[PDB]
Design a protein around this ligand. Structure first.
Ligand SMILES: Nc1ccn([C@@H]2O[C@H](CO)[C@@H](O)[C@H]2O)c(=O)n1
Ligand SMILES: Nc1ccn([C@@H]2O[C@H](CO)[C@@H](O)[C@H]2O)c(=O)n1
Lengths: 227, 226
C-alpha cells in the first residue's frame, strides 16, 4: 500500500476541507499521486460538498465519496432525519483500502471532529484510523479555547495509538491579534505546526491556491509522507 | 470533610460561570452551605471577576481565588504576557482542601476547559480534581460540535479516573432550533443532563436568578450531593 492520512479537526468549521485541498495541492506539486476520500457528507441540501470543493481548489480528480445526507447536522442526526442509515465500519474501510496503493497519498477527511460518529455503533474516524493504520493530521484554530481542544484531540489519538502527523492552523489571520500569536506559539510547544493557511484561502483561484499551498507546507515534510 | 465538585467546560464561553452560580443557588436553597473557589481568573481587563458574578447571581460569600490576569487568554498565556507566574499546584490544592468542610458543597471553577494549564508546573484542572478526589460536572453547549467536545472531555475524565457528575447545558436557546433540539436528546444519551439553563440568565436579578436556578436543577439530586 501507500500512505493514508486522516484529516481531522478539533471542532467544526476549522478549515479541514481547505487544509485537505492545500496538502493535496502541495503533494501533487511534489509529484505525489493524491486521492481524497470523504466517507460521510452532511448538509448536501444546503449545497455542502467537501469533495467537490477540493476538486475546485486543488485540481484533484481522484475523489471518493460514500454517504450523503441532506440536513447540516451530525451524521447520526442527519441520517435519521432522512430515514437513511449510517454506513457500516467495513464499508468505510473498504472505500479507503480500495483507493490505497503504493506511492499514493490518500487523504480521509472526517465529518466534524474526531469522535463524531460515522458508523454504527459509536464508530469514529479514530477507529477508522486504526483499521486502515492511518496517522492523523489535526486542524486547529488560533482562537481562544484552541489549546484545550487541541490537547483533548491529541489525547484521544494517543489513547488508541494513532499517530499524530502534526497540526495545521486552518485559518491564520493577517495581521495576527495578540491572542492568535500566543496560541500559535503555545501550539508549537504542543506539537509540530506543519502549516498555517491564510484566511480566505478558499476564495483563491486555481493558481493562487496551488502557490499558497506550496508555500504553506514544508516541501521536505510533504515529500517524506510517501516512500 | 464535605463534597468537592469541579465545574469544567468543553470550551470557553459556554456559560460555565452562570452554571456555577446556578448550582450554588439551587444548593443553597436546599439548605446547603456553598463555597465557590476559582483559583485562576483571566480577562479581568474587559470587566471581569467570575467570583463577583457568582456572588451577585447566587449570593455566595465564601468566594476564594488566588490569581487574576487582565488579558482574555488562557492562564498560562495571560501569566506569560503578564511577567508573573501561575500559582503553584500546592497553593490550589491546599486552598480547596482548606475550604472543604462537612456539609459544604465546594464548587471549583476552572479557567476555560478541562486540560488547560492551571498551575505549576503544567498542572491542569484534571490534576486538581484527582488530588482532592472531586467529581467533575461538565458544562456543554447545544450547538453543532458539542457531541465531539463532550466525548473528548468525558474520555479525558475517565482516563484519569475522575468521576463524572453529569453535564449541564450552559445556554439553552429560545427558540431551540434544529440542531440544539437534536443535541439535547443526543447529549442525554451520553450522560445525565442535570440542567439546561435558559439563555440570558446572567442578566437576571438575584430573586429571578434563584427562581430560575431552583427550577433548573432536580431538587433531589442537588440535596443528594451533600
Ligand atoms: N484558510 C481558510 C480556511 C477556511 N476558509 C473558509 O472558512 C470556512 C471554514 O473555516 C469555510 O467556509 C472555508 O471556505 C477559508 O476561506 N480559508
Ligand atoms: N444561561 C446563560 C449562559 C450564559 N449567559 C451569558 O453568556 C455569556 C457567554 O457565556 C456569559 O458570560 C453570560 O453573560 C447567559 O446569559 N445565560
Amino acid at each position: 500500500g501507500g500512505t493514508i492520512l486522516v484529516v481531522t479537526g478539533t471542532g467544526t468549521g476549522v478549515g479541514k476541507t481547505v487544509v485537505c485541498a492545500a496538502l493535496a495541492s502541495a503533494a501533487r506539486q511534489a509529484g505525489i499521486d493524491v486521492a481524497v476520500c470523504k466517507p460521510v457528507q452532511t448538509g448536501t441540501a444546503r449545497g455542502d460538498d467537501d469533495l467537490a470543493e477540493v476538486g475546485r481548489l486543488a485540481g484533484v480528480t481522484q475523489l471518493a465519496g460514500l454517504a450523503r445526507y441532506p440536513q447540516p447536522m451530525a451524521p447520526a442526526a442527519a441520517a435519521e432525519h432522512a430515514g437513511m442509515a449510517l454506513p457500516a465500519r467495513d464499508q468505510i474501510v473498504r472505500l479507503i483500502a480500495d483507493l490505497d496503493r503504493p506511492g499514493r497519498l490518500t487523504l480521509v477527511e472526517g465529518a466534524g471532529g474526531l469522535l463524531v460518529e460515522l458508523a454504527e455503533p459509536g464508530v469514529t474516524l479514530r477507529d477508522v484510523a486504526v483499521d486502515v493504520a492511518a496517522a492523523a493530521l489535526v486542524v486547529v484554530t488560533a482562537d481562544l479555547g484552541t489549546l484545550n481542544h487541541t490537547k483533548l484531540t491529541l489525547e484521544a489519538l494517543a489513547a488508541q495509538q494513532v499517530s499524530c502527523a502534526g497540526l495545521v492552523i486552518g485559518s491564520w489571520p493577517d495581521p495576527p491579534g495578540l491572542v492568535a500569536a500566543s496560541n500559535r506559539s503555545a501550539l508549537a510547544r504542543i506539537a509540530m505546526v506543519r502549516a498555517a493557511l491564510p484566511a480566505g484561502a478558499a476564495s483563491l483561484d486555481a493558481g493562487d491556491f496551488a502557490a499558497m499551498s506550496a508555500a504553506a507546507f514544508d516541501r521536505n515534510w510533504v515529500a517524506g509522507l510517501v516512500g
